[PDB]
Design a protein around this ligand. Structure first.
Ligand SMILES: CC(C)C[C@H](C[Si](O)(O)CNC(=O)CCc1ccccc1)C(=O)N[C@@H](CC(C)C)C(=O)O
Ligand code: CA
Ligand code: CA
Ligand code: CA
Ligand code: CA
Ligand code: ZN
Length: 316
């Protein structure tokens, strides 16, 4: 809508207070005009029709329980946008400042989230397995990254390419988490998962096997579930990414960590320059070393660490 840019205040899923960019026109809307072509947050009102209606508030104060998820989706989207802009010099997911849209309160007791090809969607969870998904910054960034991937490499959502697609989302979701410095970790969705059970998480990048995910190419899932295990085999790449950044010894192979920042640069470059819709793990390996090479030279430690990492997860 057309109106006056302003700032509201509200409480997020975790009960934290924060300021949000809104737009004033009769009502106060969850419309952030400060970022690219804007960030829009909608209310799906427990239905499945999208996107629903642009979030309207009467007083610019979002302290109602029903508001929480909207606050977070809106806020975290902004943070994610900033990350891409500040860090990778990317303007929105399309690189052309496309408007970012999210819908919350999707369905009833919906334990998931997704990028529908046009926007982000978040369920509220059943309150047992999950709480409103937008409460996790890694989650929001994961979703937004799916968009980035779509506009770039276009990795098809199945089998190996789909696993890569997933890993990308986990990696960047994690990097964004570190970027915001919000109790950063190498875990996925710990903030909205099992309300419930402390210390747990949906996925682990540092130790995927902890949750039954493969951490070695030899343990790759080859069935048909999960689109051919896109959310499973991602653990392999996730583990690799972890090693590149943090370093360590996995299956007898030692990897010298190069740090988060370099990890991001390397992966972003691979994503945007070398990956294709049908790329596989092995292709991912080549893209990654090519990027590092481009960035730090063939004889660099960076290239070295990338190689060891892939070796460590049995990806040649
Ligand atoms: C919390 C976690 C990061 C959320 C992830 C969502 Si997703 O974007 O990877 C996949 N979402 C869907 O498949 C929703 C249905 C759909 C809509 C449109 C097109 C295709 C599918 C995530 O990792 N989800 C996985 C784990 C769940 C327990 C949350 C999963 O969906 O398997
Ligand atoms: Ca209000
Ligand atoms: Ca965390
Ligand atoms: Ca996390
Ligand atoms: Ca938990
Ligand atoms: Zn995903």
């Amino acid at each position: 809508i057309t109106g006056t840019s302003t700032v509201g205040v509200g409480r997020g899923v975790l009960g934290d207070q924060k300021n949000i960019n809104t737009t004033y026109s009769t009502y106060y809307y969850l419309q952030d005009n400060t970022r690219g072509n804007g960030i829009f947050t909608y209310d799906a009102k427990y239905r499945t029709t999208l996107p629903g209606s642009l979030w309207a508030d009467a007083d610019n104060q979002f302290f109602a329980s029903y508001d929480a998820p909207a606050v977070d989706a809106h806020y975290y989207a902004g943070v994610t946008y900033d990350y891409y802009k500040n860090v990778h010099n990317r303007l929105s997911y399309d690189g052309n400042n496309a408007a970012i849209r999210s819908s919350v309160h999707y369905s009833q007791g919906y334990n998931n989230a997704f990028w529908n090809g046009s926007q982000m969607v978040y369920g509220d969870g059943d309150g047992q397995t999950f709480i409103p998904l937008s409460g996790g910054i890694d989650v929001v960034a994961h979703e937004l990254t799916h968009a980035v991937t779509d506009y770039t490499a276009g990795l098809i959502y199945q089998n190996e390419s789909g696993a890569i697609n997933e890993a990308i989302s986990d990696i960047f979701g994690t990097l964004v988490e570190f970027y915001a410095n919000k109790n950063p970790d190498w875990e996925i969705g710990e903030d909205v998962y099992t309300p419930g059970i402390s210390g747990d998480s949906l996925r682990s990048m540092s130790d995927p096997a902890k949750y039954g995910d493969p951490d070695h190419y030899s343990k790759r899932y080859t069935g048909t579930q999960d689109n051919g295990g896109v959310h499973i085999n991602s653990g392999i790449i996730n583990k690799a990414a972890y090693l590149i950044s943090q370093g360590g010894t996995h299956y007898g192979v030692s990897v010298v960590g190069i740090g988060r920042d370099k990890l991001g640069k390397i992966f972003y470059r691979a994503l945007t320059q070398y990956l294709t819709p049908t790329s596989n793990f092995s292709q991912l390996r080549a893209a990654a070393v090519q990027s590092a090479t481009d960035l730090y030279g063939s004889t660099s430690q960076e290239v070295a660490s990338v190689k060891q990492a892939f070796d460590a997860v049995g990806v040649k």
